[PDB]
Symmetry: D2
Subunit: 317 residues, 4 copies
């Protein structure tokens, strides 16, 4: 039986018999994702170059405006905005959304994969809405996922029921369900990190990476892949198995990836698909944030690969 993103959410939304705000939120998010994909693929670029005589800004504006107008959100945290956006009272709903509207777009000059990352919370305090409402642990996520604008445009959605993948058919502008209840391999064969920071690695990371290239059990060495765009890297890990690392280094002593709208949604997806996501010291999903743009070190992926790293991490205290 064919399924679309909209029918899938609505059917899951009917079973839960909730208020319907989460469905309008996700439906609006889906529309923004299609608009972003169309602009990322350069639809209408001929008009910019004079056939008749900024991208991350457009993406943020698309997501901001579809979310505000859904009547489903109250607080919006974006990589593009310094402060949280408080939805005006007539459009206020009960959900908090943290999102990177176009992650990896700093390198978009080379047509590298980019993506949108999002995490959805139910507002937790009864106070008037403020930035504090987005400072929740990832354990509290109601919904999370990403759209990868890669060779094709895919939407990965994780909820309590698990992880589902939707391929965007651009001929009809519909998200088609193609991979139901996806689960990551117990053990992968690809590790993913920027080895250029090798001079600033902590000893556990140095030793773990050494074990991937020169296995102590004479097994096959892992291959390395690092796209430099987090959505593309995490999606490859989920589909192929393996491990993704962005640990702390000298230029980024608290890590580089953002906890609210990069690490937590990926940690959410990883855990619902049977993977792991750790900072080294604790679960990514267990970090309680204090700042909306705060950074975190992150190691995620197939459980055997993350546990093997934690085993090495504990060797170094």
């Amino acid at each position: 039986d064919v399924n679309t993103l909209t029918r899938f959410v609505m059917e899951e939304g009917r079973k839960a018999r909730g208020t319907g705000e989460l469905t309008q939120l996700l439906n609006s998010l889906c529309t923004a994702v299609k608009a972003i994909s169309s602009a990322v693929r350069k639809a209408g670029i001929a008009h910019l170059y004079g056939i008749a005589g900024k991208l991350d800004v457009l993406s943020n504006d698309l997501v901001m405006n579809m979310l505000k107008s859904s009547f489903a959100t109250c607080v919006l945290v974006s990589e593009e905005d310094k402060h949280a956006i408080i939805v005006e009272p007539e459009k206020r709903g009960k959900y908090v959304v943290c999102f990177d509207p176009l992650d990896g777009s700093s390198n978009i000059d080379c047509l590298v994969s980019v993506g949108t990352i999002f995490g959805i919370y139910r507002k937790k305090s009864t106070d008037e809405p403020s930035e504090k409402d987005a400072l929740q642990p990832g354990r509290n996520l109601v919904a999370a996922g990403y759209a990868l604008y890669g060779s094709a445009t895919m939407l990965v959605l994780a909820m309590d029921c698990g992880v589902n993948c939707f391929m965007l058919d651009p001929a009809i502008g519909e998200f088609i369900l193609v991979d139901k209840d996806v689960k990551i391999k117990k053990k992968g064969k690809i590790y993913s990190l920027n080895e250029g920071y090798a001079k600033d690695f902590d000893p556990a990371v140095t030793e773990y990476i050494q074990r991937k290239k020169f296995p102590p059990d004479n097994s096959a060495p892992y291959g390395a892949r690092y796209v430099g765009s987090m959505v593309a890297d995490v999606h490859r890990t989920l589909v192929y198995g393996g491990i993704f690392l962005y640990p702390a280094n000298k230029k980024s002593p608290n890590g580089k990836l953002r906890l609210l709208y990069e690490c937590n949604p990926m940690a959410y997806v990883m855990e619902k698909a049977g993977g792991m996501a750790t900072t080294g010291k604790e679960a990514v999903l267990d970090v309680i944030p204090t700042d909306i743009h705060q950074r975190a070190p992150v190691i995620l992926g197939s459980p055997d690969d993350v546990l093997e790293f934690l085993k090495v991490y504990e060797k170094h205290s």
Copy 2:
């Protein structure tokens, strides 16, 4: 003034006062690339999943059929075909085309960027067309380039006039001229290779990559990027500068990449854009091939970076 690929090629053909076969060839290849792109982006996937009731093969068939029906070709070498394809006599034209119809498609399941690589040679003799007509060194190339099916679709075309980049506007199916006569940085800050096989590196490769991570002076260590799809990694090298390595080692004395439809067209693009491309022992374009599928090692990118590799390469010779 707005410019498209089709208007552009024709204007180059009129200046050159050629027979027009090469213009018909490039226009045919452009139509194939637009068809491949539509398929990579999953147009019509809704019909596959039962809404109303092969990707490397199709790419090959699109290029093959558009090339044969251009009346501009006589011999076709494909990554997908064991022997060269001899165009039937009624359709024979004067050019020889080597191509990879969908490079990177082994990992297309994770929606990594893929691409089409192509190199166009003039047939050299009036003898009956045969595979021997493809055994020319890359130096004899009349035209070469690639299509990157990335976050957007771009066609990079190199001729005697230089390297030009065309963006595909999917709204109108036209390739828009966006980067004229592009030149690679004299020196970059990114190195690209699969570091997972460090256990099998040539010792010279080991020392070179160590220098990128641990510079003996006070310069910045390079960042690492490796998509694992050649078109994307080389295109990132062209736009940003840096170095791309798929080198020879002991276990693979000739490298892994294919010379005719991976190494040569890219080596040609690099050199017309002011880069360098070497096997370690000689320039890629100078290798005389003896097998249409023979492998070659390739190291290309910014010239200062390739020369630094050659300096390390000679230290171990």
Copy 3:
């Protein structure tokens, strides 16, 4: 504030506190309309003509609407211009709604790239008996929702419900139906009549005199213009947008008209009246005819209220 078909239906559905089957029905129908649109605009035809080396459009349209409706879990009986008998949804997929639809109206002239369209009307199931074809023999008055997709110069979905008529433009760049005309109402009186005057030799006397009055007005006013696309969805949408009258009247050779009551006349009569217009068979309201055959025909005269009344004045003059 931007609004979409999906957003619009869902919040209207939330207000009503209904079961949600109607929204999943409408959302599925939206998906079929976009897939039909893609095929009508000839997406992928290069492959038909051998770019690398399959089914007729009205067959594909029927399969798209049929399959999207069945898989919505919202329908029980489906009546199609393409199928002799009503289709009874299998039990595991059954919902409480009856949908009559024309999957691709006007396709007789699709070789000339004429405007084509999809027509649809949605009913509620009335009895607790096992679902059967007679559940589709309800009068148009019983319509829960009705509308059409017009595949013209652009693709528009016109949706009529109790809250009124709303028009949605398909933006193909993002595959979204954009609300562009809220609460549409037809002009009180128009300047265009629509019918096939080539068959005037077989006209009933009332139609002949009414068309005579349109070309040679007895009050020496300006004559109406004539437009006839020959594609029903295009002609009726022009009537709604510009005003005037659309006629497919009964004659001696076709005393019950030629258009089909369930999936052409009833949905169009529903849209017209929700937009403040009229639609009559000559003898009665289109929406009041109680059908006895799912493919039974009805004559139809619709459009602006003053133009239909002027027709009816002529109709009664001829008994």
Copy 4:
């Protein structure tokens, strides 16, 4: 073998051994039509309605700007411009183009089919170009045709070699050759005109239409179709056979349609397809214009049906 608009034109130009200007002309117009098609189908209308926060004017600008930049034209006559546009000197070529960029657009609110019509003349003298270059009889046409934005988008091109029909494949942005060397039926079964203006008909039109509803020889009456969009009605006459009339009456002694960029290109398309096109008194292509916007009555279509009209016209002298 598959054929495209671009490949088809190029092969015709090679056979003729021309300067290439006419090929560069047609290729630019082909791109303008694809851009018009995209806007007509309402690409990007969501951005007009605030998803992130005229049409014939745009169409004129697209045609004007693609033709100017083709370097193949010197004089442009448009339904949208009162005076002819004289191409700037660096961009001047030897061809004169008359075009209606978006015909039927007054009724575009009801989504009636619309279209672009064009006729191409060679220039008249080496003197500095002027509007006088557009005052040619239709007989002097080098090429003419139309794009119909109907249920799908089709381009009909007429040259000395005949009439060919090209379908726009919107998934790849190519015009695919679908109807080669089309020939109109000798006799049709549909007549097309605005019967609402019957009070002012000349007796010949009155008597001819009478013959279509009430055949004196016991034949079947013709059907009536009138869309109100000239490209749509004329395309139907070509595809199904029959007759289209926008004739002269007392209030419009020269008709309503414009001779240079509505009547003449259609008469040329008709005559190259074996049909006829008359004003009643003479063949449309034989009218020598004295004003670029002068009107002409037109009756075109299947030859038996036009000849039938003419004898009714001559019966009334």
